[PDB]
mmCIF file of C-alpha atoms in Angstrom:
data_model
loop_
_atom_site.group_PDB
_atom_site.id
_atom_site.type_symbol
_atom_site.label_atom_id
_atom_site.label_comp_id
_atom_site.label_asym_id
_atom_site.label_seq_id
_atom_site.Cartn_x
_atom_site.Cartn_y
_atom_site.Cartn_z
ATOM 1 C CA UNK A 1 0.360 32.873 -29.197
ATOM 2 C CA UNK A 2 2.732 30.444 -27.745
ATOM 3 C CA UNK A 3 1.148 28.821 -24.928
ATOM 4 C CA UNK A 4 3.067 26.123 -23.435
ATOM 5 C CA UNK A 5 2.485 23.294 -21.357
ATOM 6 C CA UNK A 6 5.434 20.845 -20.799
ATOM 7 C CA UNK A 7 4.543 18.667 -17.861
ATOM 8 C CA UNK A 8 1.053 19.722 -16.904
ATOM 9 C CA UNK A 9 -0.373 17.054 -14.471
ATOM 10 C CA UNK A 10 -4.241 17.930 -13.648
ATOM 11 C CA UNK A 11 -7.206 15.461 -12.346
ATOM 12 C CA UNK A 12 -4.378 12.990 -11.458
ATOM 13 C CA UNK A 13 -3.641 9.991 -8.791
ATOM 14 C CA UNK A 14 -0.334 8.500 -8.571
ATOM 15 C CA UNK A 15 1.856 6.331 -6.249
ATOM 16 C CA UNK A 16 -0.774 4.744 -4.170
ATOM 17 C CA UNK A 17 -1.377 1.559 -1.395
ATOM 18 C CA UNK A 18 -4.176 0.106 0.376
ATOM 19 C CA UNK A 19 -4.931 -2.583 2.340
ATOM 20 C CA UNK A 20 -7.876 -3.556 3.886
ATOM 21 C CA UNK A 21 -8.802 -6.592 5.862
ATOM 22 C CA UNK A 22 -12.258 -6.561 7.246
ATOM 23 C CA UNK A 23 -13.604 -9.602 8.637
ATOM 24 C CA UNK A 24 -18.103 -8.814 7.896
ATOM 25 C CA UNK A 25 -18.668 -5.865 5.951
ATOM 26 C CA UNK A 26 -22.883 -5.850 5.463
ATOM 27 C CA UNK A 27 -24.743 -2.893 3.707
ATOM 28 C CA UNK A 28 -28.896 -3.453 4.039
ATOM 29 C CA UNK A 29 -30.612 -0.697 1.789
ATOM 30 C CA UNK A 30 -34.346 -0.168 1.436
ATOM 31 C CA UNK A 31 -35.275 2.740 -0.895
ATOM 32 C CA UNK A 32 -32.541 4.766 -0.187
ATOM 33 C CA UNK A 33 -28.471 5.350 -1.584
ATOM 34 C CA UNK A 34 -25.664 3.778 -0.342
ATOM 35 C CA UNK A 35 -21.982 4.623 -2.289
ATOM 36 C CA UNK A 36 -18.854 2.545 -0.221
ATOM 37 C CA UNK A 37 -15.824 2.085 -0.815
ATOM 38 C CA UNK A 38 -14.010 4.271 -3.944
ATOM 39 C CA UNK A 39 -10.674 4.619 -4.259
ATOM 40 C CA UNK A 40 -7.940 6.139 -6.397
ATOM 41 C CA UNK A 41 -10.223 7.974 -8.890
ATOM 42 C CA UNK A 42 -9.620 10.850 -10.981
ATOM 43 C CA UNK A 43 -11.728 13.527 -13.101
ATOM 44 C CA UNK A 44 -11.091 16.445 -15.284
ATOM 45 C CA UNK A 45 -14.032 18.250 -16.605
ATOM 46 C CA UNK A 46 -14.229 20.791 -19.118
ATOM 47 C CA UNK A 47 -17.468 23.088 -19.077
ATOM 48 C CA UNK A 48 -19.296 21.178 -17.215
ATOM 49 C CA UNK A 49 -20.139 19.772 -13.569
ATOM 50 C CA UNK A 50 -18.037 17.256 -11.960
ATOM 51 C CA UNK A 51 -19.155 14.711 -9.010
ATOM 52 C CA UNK A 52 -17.545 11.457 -7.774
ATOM 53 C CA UNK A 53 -19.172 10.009 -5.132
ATOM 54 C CA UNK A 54 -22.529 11.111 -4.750
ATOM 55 C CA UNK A 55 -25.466 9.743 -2.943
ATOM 56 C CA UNK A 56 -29.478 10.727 -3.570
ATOM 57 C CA UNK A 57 -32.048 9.400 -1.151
ATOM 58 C CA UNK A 58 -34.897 9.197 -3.342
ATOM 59 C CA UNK A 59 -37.538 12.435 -5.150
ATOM 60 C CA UNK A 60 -40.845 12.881 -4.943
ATOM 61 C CA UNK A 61 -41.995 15.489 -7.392
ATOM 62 C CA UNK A 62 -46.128 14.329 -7.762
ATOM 63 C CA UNK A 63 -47.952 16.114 -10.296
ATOM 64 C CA UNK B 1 -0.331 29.697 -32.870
ATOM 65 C CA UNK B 2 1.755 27.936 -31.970
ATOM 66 C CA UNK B 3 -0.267 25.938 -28.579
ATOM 67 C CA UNK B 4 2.571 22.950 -27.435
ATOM 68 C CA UNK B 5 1.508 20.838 -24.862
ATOM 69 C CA UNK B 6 4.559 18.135 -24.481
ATOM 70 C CA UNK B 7 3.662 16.163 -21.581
ATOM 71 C CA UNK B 8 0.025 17.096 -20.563
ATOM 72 C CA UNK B 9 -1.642 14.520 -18.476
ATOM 73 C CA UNK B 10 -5.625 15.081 -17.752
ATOM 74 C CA UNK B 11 -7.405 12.492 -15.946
ATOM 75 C CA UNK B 12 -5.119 9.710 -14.710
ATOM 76 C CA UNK B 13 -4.715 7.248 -12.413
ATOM 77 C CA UNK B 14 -0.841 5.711 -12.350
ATOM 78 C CA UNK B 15 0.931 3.103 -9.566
ATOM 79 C CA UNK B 16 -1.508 1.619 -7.575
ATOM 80 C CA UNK B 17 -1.234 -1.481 -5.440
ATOM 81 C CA UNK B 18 -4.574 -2.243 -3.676
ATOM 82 C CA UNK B 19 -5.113 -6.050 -1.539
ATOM 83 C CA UNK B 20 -8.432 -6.413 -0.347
ATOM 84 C CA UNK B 21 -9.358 -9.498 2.370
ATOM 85 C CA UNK B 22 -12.703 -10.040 3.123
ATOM 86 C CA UNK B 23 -14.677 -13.319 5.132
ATOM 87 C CA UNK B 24 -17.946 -12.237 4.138
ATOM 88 C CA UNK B 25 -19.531 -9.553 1.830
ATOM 89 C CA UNK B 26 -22.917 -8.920 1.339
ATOM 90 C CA UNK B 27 -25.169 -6.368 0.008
ATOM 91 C CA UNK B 28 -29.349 -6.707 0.320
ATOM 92 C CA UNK B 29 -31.215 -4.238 -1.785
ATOM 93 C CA UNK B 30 -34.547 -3.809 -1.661
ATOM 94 C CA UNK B 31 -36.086 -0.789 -3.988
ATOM 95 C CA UNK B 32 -32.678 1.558 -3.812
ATOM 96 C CA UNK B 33 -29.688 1.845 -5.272
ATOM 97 C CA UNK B 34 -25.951 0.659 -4.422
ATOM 98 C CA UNK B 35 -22.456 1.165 -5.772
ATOM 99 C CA UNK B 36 -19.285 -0.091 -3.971
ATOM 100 C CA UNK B 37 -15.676 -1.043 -4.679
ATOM 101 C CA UNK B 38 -14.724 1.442 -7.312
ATOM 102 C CA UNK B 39 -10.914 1.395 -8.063
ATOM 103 C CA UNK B 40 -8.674 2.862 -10.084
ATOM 104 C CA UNK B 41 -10.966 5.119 -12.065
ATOM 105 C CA UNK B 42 -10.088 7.639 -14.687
ATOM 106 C CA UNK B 43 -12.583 10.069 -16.751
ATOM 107 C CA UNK B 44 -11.753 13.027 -18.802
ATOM 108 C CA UNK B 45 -14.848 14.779 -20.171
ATOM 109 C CA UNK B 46 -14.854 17.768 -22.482
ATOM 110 C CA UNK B 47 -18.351 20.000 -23.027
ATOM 111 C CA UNK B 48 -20.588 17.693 -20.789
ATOM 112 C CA UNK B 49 -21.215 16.576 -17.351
ATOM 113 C CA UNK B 50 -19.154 13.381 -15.997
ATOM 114 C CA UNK B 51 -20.172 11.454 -12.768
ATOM 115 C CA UNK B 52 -17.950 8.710 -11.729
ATOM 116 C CA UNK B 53 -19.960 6.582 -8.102
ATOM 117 C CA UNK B 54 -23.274 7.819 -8.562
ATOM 118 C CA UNK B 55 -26.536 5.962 -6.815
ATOM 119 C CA UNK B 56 -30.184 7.405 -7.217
ATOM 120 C CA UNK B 57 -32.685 5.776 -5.193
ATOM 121 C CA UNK B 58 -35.968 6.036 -6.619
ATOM 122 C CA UNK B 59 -37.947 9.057 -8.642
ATOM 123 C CA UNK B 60 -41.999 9.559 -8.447
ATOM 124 C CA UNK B 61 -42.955 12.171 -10.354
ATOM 125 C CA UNK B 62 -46.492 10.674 -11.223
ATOM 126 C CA UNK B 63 -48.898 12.306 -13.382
ATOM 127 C CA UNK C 1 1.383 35.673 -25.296
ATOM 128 C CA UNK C 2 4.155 33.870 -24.324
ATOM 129 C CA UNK C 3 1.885 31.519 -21.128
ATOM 130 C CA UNK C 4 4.591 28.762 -20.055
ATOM 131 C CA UNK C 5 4.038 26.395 -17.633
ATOM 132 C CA UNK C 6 6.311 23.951 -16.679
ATOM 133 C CA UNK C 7 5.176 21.469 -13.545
ATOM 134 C CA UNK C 8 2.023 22.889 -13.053
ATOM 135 C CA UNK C 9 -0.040 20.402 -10.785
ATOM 136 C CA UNK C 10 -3.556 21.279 -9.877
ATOM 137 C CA UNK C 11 -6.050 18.771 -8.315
ATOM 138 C CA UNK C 12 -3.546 15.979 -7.824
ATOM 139 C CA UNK C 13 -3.122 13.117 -4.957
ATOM 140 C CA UNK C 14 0.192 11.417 -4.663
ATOM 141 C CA UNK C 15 1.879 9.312 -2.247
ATOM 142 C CA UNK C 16 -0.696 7.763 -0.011
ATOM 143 C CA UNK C 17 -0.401 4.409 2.099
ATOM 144 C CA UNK C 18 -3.262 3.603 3.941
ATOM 145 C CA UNK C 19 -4.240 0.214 6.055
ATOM 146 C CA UNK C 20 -7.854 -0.638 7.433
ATOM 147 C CA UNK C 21 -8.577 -3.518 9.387
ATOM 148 C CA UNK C 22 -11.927 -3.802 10.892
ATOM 149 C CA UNK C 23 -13.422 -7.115 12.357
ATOM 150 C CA UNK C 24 -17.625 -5.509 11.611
ATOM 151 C CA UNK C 25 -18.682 -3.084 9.025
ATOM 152 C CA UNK C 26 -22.141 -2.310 8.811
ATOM 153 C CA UNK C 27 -24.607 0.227 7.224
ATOM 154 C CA UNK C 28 -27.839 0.190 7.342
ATOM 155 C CA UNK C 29 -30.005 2.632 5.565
ATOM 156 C CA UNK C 30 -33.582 3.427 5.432
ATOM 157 C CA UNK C 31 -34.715 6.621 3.012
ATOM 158 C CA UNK C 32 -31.788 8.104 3.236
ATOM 159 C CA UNK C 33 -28.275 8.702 1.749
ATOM 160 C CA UNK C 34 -24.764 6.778 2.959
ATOM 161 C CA UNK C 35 -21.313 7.643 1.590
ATOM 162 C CA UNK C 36 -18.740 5.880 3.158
ATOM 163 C CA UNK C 37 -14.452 5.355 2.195
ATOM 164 C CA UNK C 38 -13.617 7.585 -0.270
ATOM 165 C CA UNK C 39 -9.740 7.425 -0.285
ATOM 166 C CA UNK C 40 -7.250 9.155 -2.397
ATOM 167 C CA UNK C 41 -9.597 11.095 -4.959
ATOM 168 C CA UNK C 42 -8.449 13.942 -7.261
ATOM 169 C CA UNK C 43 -10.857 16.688 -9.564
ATOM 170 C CA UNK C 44 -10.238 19.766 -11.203
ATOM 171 C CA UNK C 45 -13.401 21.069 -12.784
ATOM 172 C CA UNK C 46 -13.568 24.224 -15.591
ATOM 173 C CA UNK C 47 -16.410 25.941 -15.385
ATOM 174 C CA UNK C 48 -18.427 23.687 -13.707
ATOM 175 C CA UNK C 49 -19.109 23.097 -10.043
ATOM 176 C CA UNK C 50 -17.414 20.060 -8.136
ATOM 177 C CA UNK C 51 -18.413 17.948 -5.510
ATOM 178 C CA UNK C 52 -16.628 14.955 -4.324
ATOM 179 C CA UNK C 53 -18.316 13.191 -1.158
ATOM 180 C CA UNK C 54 -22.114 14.525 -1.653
ATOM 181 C CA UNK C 55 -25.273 13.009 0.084
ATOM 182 C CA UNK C 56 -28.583 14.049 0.146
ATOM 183 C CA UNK C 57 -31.508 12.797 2.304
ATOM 184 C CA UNK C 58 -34.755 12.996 0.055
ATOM 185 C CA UNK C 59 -36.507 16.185 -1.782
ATOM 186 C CA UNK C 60 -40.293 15.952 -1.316
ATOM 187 C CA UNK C 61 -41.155 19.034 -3.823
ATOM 188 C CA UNK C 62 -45.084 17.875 -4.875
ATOM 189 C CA UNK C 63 -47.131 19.544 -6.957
ATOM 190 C CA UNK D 1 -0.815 -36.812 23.222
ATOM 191 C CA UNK D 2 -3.333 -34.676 22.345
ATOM 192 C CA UNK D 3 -1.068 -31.699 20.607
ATOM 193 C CA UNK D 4 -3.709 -29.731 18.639
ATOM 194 C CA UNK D 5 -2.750 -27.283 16.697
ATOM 195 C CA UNK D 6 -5.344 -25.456 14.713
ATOM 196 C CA UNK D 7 -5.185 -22.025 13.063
ATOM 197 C CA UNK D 8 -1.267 -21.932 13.987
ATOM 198 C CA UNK D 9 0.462 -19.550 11.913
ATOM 199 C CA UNK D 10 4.259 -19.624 11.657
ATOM 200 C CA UNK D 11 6.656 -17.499 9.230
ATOM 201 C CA UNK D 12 3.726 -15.689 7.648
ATOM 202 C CA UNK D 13 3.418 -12.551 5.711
ATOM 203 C CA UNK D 14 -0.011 -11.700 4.340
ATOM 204 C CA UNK D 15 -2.185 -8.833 3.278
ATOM 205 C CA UNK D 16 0.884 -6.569 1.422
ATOM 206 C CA UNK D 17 0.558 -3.753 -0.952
ATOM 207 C CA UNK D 18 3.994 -1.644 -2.487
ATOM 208 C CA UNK D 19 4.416 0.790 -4.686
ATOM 209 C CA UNK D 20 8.550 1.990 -6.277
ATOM 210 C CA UNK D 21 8.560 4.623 -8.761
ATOM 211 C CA UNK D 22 11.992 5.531 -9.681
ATOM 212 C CA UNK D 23 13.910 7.387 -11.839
ATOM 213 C CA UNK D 24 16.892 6.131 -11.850
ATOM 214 C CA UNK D 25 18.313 3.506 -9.694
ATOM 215 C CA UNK D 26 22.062 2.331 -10.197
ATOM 216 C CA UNK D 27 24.114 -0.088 -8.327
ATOM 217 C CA UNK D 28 28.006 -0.436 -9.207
ATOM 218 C CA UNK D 29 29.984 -3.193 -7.268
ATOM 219 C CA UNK D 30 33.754 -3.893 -7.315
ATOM 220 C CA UNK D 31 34.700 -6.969 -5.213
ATOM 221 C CA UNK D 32 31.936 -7.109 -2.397
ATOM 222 C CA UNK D 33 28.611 -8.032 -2.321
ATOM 223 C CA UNK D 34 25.417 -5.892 -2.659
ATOM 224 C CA UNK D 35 21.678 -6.960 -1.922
ATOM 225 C CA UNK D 36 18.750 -4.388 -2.245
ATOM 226 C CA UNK D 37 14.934 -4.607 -2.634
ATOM 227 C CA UNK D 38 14.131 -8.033 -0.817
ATOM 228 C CA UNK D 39 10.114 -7.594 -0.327
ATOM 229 C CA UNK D 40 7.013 -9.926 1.217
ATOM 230 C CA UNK D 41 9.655 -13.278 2.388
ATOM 231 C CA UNK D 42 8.506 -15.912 4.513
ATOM 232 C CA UNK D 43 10.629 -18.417 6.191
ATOM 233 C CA UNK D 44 10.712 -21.427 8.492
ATOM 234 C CA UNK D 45 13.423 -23.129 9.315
ATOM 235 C CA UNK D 46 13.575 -26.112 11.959
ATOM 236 C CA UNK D 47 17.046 -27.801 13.623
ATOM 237 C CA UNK D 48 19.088 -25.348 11.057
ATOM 238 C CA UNK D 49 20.183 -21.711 11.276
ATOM 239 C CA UNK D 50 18.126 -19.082 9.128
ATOM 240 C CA UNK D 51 19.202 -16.135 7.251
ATOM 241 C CA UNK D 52 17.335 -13.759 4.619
ATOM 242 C CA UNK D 53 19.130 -10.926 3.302
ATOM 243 C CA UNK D 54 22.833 -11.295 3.964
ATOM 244 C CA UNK D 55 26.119 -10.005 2.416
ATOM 245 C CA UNK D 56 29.429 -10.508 2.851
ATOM 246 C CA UNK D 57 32.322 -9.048 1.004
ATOM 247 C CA UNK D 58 35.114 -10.867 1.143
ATOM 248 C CA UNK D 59 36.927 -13.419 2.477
ATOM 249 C CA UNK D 60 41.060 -14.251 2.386
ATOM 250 C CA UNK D 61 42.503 -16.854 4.303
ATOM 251 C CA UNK D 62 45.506 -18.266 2.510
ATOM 252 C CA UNK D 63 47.422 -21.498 3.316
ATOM 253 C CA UNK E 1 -0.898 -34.202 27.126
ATOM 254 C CA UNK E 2 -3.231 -31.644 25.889
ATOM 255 C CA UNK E 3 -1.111 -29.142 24.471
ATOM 256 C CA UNK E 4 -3.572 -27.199 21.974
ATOM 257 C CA UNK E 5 -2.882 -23.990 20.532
ATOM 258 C CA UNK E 6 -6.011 -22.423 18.619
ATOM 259 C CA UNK E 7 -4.520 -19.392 16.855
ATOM 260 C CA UNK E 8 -1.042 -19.051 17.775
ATOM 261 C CA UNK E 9 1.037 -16.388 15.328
ATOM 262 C CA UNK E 10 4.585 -16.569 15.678
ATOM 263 C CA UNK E 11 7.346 -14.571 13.642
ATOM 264 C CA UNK E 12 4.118 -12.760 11.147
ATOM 265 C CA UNK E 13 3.902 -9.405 9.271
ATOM 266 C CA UNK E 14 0.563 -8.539 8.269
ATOM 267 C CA UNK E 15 -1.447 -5.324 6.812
ATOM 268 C CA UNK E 16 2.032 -3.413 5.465
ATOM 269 C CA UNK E 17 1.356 -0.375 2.834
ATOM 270 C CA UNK E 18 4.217 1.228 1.374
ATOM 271 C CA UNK E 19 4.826 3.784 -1.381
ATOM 272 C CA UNK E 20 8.551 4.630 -1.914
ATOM 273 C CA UNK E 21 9.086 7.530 -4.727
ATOM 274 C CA UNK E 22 12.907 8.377 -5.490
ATOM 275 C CA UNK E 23 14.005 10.088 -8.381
ATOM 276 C CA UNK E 24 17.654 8.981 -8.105
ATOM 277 C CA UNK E 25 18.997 5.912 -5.966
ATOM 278 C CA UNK E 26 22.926 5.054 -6.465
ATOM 279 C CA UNK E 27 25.118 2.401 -4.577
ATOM 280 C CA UNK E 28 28.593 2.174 -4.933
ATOM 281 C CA UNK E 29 30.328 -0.755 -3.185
ATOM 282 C CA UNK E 30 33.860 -1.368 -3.074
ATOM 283 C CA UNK E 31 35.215 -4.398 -1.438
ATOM 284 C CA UNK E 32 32.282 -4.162 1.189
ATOM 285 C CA UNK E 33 29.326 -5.060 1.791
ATOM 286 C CA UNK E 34 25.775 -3.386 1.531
ATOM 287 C CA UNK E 35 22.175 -4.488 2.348
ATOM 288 C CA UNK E 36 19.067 -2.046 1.352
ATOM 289 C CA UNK E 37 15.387 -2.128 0.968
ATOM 290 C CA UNK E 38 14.315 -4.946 3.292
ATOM 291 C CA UNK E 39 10.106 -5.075 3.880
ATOM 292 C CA UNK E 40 7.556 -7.490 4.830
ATOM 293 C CA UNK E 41 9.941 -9.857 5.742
ATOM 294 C CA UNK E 42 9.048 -12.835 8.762
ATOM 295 C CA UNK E 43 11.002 -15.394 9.701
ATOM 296 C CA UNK E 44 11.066 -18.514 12.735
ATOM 297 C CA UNK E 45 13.761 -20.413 13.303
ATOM 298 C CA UNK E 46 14.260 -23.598 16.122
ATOM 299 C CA UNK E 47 16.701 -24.499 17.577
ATOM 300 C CA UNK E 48 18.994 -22.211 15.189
ATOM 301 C CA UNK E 49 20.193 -18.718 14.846
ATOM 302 C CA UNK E 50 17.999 -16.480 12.900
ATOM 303 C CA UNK E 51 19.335 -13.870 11.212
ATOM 304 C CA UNK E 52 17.492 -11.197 8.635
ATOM 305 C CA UNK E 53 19.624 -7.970 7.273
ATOM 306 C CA UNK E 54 23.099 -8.764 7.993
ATOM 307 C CA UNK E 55 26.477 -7.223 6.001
ATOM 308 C CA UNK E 56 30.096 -7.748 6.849
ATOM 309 C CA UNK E 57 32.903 -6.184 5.026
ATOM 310 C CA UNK E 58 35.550 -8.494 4.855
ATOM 311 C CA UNK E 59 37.676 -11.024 6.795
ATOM 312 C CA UNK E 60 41.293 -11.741 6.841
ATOM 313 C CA UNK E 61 42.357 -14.562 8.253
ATOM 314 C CA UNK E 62 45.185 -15.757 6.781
ATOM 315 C CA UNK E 63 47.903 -18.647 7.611
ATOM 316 C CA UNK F 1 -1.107 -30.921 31.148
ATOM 317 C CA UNK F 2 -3.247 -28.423 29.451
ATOM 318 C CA UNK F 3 -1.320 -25.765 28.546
ATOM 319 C CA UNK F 4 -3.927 -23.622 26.502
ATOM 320 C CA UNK F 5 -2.883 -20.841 23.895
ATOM 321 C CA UNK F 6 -5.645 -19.134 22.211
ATOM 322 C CA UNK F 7 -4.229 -15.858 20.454
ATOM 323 C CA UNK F 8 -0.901 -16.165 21.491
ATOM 324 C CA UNK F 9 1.000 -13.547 19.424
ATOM 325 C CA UNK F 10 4.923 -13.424 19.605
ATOM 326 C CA UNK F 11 7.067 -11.408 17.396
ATOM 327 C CA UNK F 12 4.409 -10.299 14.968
ATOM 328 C CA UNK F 13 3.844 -6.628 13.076
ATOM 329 C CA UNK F 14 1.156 -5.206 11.694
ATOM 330 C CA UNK F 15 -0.940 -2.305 10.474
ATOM 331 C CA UNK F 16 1.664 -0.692 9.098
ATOM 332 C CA UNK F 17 1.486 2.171 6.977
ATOM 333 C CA UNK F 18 5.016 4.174 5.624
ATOM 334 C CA UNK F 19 5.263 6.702 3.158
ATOM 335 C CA UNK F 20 9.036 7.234 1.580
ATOM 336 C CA UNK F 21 9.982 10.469 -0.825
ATOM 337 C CA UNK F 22 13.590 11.135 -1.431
ATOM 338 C CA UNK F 23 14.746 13.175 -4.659
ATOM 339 C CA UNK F 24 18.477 11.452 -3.974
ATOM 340 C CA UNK F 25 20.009 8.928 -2.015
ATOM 341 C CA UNK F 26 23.315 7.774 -2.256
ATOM 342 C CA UNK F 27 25.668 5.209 -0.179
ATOM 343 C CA UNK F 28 29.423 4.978 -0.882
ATOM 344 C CA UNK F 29 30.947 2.147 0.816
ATOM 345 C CA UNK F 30 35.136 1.108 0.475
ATOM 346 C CA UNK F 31 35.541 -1.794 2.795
ATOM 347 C CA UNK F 32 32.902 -1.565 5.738
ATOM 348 C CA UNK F 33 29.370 -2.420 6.125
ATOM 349 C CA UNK F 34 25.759 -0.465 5.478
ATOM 350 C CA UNK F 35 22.270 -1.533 5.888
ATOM 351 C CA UNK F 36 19.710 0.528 5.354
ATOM 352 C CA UNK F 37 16.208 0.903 5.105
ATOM 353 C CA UNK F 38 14.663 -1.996 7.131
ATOM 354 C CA UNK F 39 10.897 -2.098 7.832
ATOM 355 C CA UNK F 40 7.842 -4.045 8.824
ATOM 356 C CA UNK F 41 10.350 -6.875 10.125
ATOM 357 C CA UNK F 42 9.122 -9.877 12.503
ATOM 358 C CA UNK F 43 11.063 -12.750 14.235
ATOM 359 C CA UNK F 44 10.799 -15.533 16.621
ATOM 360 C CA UNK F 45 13.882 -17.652 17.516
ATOM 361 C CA UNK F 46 13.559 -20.584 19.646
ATOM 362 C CA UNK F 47 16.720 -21.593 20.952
ATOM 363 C CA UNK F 48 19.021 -19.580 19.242
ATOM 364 C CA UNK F 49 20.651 -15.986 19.017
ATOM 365 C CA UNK F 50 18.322 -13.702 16.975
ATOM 366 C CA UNK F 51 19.437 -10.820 14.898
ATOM 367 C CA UNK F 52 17.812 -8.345 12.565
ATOM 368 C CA UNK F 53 19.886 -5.096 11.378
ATOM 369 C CA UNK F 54 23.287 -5.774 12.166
ATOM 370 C CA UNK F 55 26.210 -4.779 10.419
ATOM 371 C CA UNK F 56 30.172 -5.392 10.807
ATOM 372 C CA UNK F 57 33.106 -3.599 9.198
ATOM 373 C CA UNK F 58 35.770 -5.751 8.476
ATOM 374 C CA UNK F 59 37.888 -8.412 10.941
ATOM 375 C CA UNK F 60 41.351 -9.143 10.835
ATOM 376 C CA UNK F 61 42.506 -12.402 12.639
ATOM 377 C CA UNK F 62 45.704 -13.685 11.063
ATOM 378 C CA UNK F 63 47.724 -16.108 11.695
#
């Protein structure tokens, strides 16, 4: 009847640094899934599923 | 009745710093499916699904 | 009837530093599923499953 | 009389990431000096003296 | 007479990540001197003095 | 007569990751010296003194 929120933080990233120094970065891919490199990502789902860094070879499902 | 939500925060992505040195880069696809260098992402999703680095790669479901 | 919260924080990242330095990065991938890097990720999901770093090989479910 | 000098690196800052979230930040000087938050400097001096972040207060030498 | 230097780094700061959260930060200075916060910070000097964070109250050196 | 320096590394830092959370700080100074909060820092001096963090309350010489 009196729900209250006053500084509710959810599904958040804050205060963040990266560095990266690579000198050859190669990805070769042939009929597969390749997910690299994800950073500082955030997600708040409400009924309903939630995934950020997913990866699905490949389905076969014939007839 | 009386539902107060002052300083709700859902979903977010605040005070990033992100330095990134490469030489060389590459990516060779052949028949897949590739996602990389995702940064600083933010999703909120209300009654459905939500995917943020997703890669599939390849359905047969002949016939 | 009277729900208060004040600083609640659920699924949250804050206050990361992170450095990488790598001369050779490579992936190679043939079929299958890679997920690689996944740095300073947050989710909250309501009634809903949640995956973050997911990888599947292939499904071979014919006929 | 061959000097050969070729990737030479001298008085170098590279590959920097920060992040400052404050509140509140205050500084209140009477009669000195004050020097805060000096970030990513580079310096080469040659045949002369080299300073980066320096404070003095005060200095009395009458007659 | 064949002096070569291929990949000489002198006086170099490289890769740094910092975060720095504070809610309050206050300096009071009276008559004095203060130095804070100093990062990333390179410096070479010949045939001179090299100095990088340096405070001195006061001097008195009268008549 | 061939004085050879490939990778000659002299007062160099990296990879350097620092994380800093303080609810308060506070530095009252009346007539001395304070430096704080010095990092990721490099220096070569070639004929001269070197100093980084150095601090001096007060001198009295007169007359």
């Amino acid at each position: 009847v009196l729900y209250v929120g006053s500084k509710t933080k959810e599904g958040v990233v804050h205060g963040v640094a990266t560095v990266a120094e690579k000198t050859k970065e190669q990805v070769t891919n042939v009929g597969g899934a390749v997910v690299t490199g994800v950073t500082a990502v955030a997600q708040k789902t409400v009924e309903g599923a939630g995934s950020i860094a997913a990866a699905t070879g490949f389905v076969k499902k014939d007839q």
